[PDB]
């Protein structure tokens, strides 16, 4: 059920320690990663226009 990611939790065998945690700011790294990936194509296309106009 933890592998199904229905709630926050993790098991343990040696010590049996139960830890529950969460990461609320999810919409930050997704939008940032999309901006980086989308801008990489912008810089590469710019290098294609300059590389085409120069050589």
């Amino acid at each position: 059920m933890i592998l199904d990611k229905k709630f926050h939790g993790i098991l343990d065998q040696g010590e049996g320690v139960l830890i529950i945690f969460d990461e609320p700011p999810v919409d930050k790294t997704y939008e940032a990663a999309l901006e980086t990936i989308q801008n990489m194509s912008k810089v590469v296309d710019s290098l294609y226009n300059k590389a085409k106009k120069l050589t």
Binding site: P25, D27, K28, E31, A32, E35
Partner: protein, 57 residues
């Protein structure tokens, strides 16, 4: 314009109106102690502005 004309208009301002009215308007756009509403935005950058940053992105 027939039988009906106008005249020019100019203004005048002394130093008392300049400093009293200028400082009064700057204070009208400023705070009381000038240190109150700064930490409000400085600490709202982590609570409310994050939504404006996500929408901005």
């Amino acid at each position: 314009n027939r039988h009906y004309y106008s005249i020019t208009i100019n203004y005048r301002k002394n130093e008392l109106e300049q400093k009293m009215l200028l400082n009064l308007h700057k204070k009208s756009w400023m705070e009381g102690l000038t240190l109150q509403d700064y930490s409000e935005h400085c600490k709202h950058n982590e609570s409310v502005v994050k939504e404006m940053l996500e929408l901005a992105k």
